[PDB]
Design a protein around this ligand. Structure first.
Ligand code: HEM
Ligand code: HEM
Ligand code: BML
Ligand code: BML
Lengths: 137, 137
């Protein structure tokens, strides 16, 4: 279930974080614009930038922390608040997050690893709702 | 995105090259008049024509290099000059290339693989513009 998925992802965070982020960018190529440094680089090329592996892991580490602190896939208001107030997220809207979760769930469904994909869909939905409440456009 | 798509195509080039060129010929059957002995044949007949596979592979080998040498989907002027000055391209105009890229983009959108189709559309347009600049009518 959801709890085990957090363990699965944490167990090999570098791989999962990189592969899910790439699935996001590949499904929604216009989102690459937010990451100027990743423009004009292939999937295999990106893994060689110290920043890429390190920065993607940091993103998915926090995602896992928000996921683990949730109750029944409902994130804490304080965690939603953190995500909105973050300076690196100043120009984002809830749609950016919606797209990430659509790509994340699609990745899980396509994988050979057994994920509670329905739960991640619901978590994504609840997070987006909590993000709007914390003032994200 | 675009740079990954190049790697994707290169990973199974002959298959992609034949399937995209076939999509082109089937969308624009009168375009066969630039080629020798393609008329009167089904897709499978063409894929068993030794020259068809060899030549179509060579077209896409070069197209991938032109894409790879590009910056932000803008090809090198010298790459465009080569395509204009090639003896095998003496009967061509920019509309021939426009048609090829319409078909390629349509193929990418229809495929189950995550191509950045909009970028290929831009690449096609920028290449046509560069062909024009290099003297193609
Ligand atoms: C639940 C989902 C998300 C979490 C947990 C999260 C978390 C983070 C974290 C921890 C960082 C700092 C990483 C570091 O530099 O150490 C960061 C930065 C950043 N975030 Fe997010 N984020 C999320 C969603 C998104 C989305 C959907 C976008 C837009 C596509 C986005 C855009 C950015 C950008 C552009 C940076 C700066 C990093 C860079 O560009 O190099 N984030 N985020
Ligand atoms: C970016 C697009 C294109 C690239 C990179 C390209 C490149 C090439 C290359 C490398 C060859 C040599 C093939 C060989 O001899 O093995 C070739 C030949 C040829 N090209 Fe193109 N070409 C492009 C577009 C087109 C288009 C749109 C047409 C016609 C609608 C066309 C018509 C031909 C013909 C008739 C030949 C020689 C005979 C044949 O290969 O069947 N090309 N081209
Ligand atoms: O650096 C980043 C990696 C992944 C996301 Br999602 C956002 C920022
Ligand atoms: O021989 C050729 C194969 C494919 C194209 Br497109 C053009 C020429």
């Amino acid at each position: 279930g959801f709890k085990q998925d957090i363990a699965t992802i944490r167990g090999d965070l570098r791989t999962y974080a990189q592969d899910i982020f790439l699935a996001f960018l590949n499904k929604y190529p216009d989102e690459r614009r937010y990451f100027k440094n990743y423009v004009g680089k292939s999937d295999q090329e990106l893994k060689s930038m110290a920043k890429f592996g390190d920065d993607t892991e940091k993103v998915f580490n926090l995602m896992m922390e928000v996921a683990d602190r949730a109750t029944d896939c409902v994130p804490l208001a304080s965690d939603a608040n953190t995500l909105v107030q973050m300076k690196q997220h100043s120009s984002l809207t809830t749609g950016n997050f919606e797209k990430l979760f659509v790509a994340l769930v699609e990745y899980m469904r396509a994988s050979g690893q057994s994920f509670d994909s329905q739960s991640w869909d619901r978590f994504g939905k609840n997070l987006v709702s909590a993000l709007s409440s914390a003032g994200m456009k």
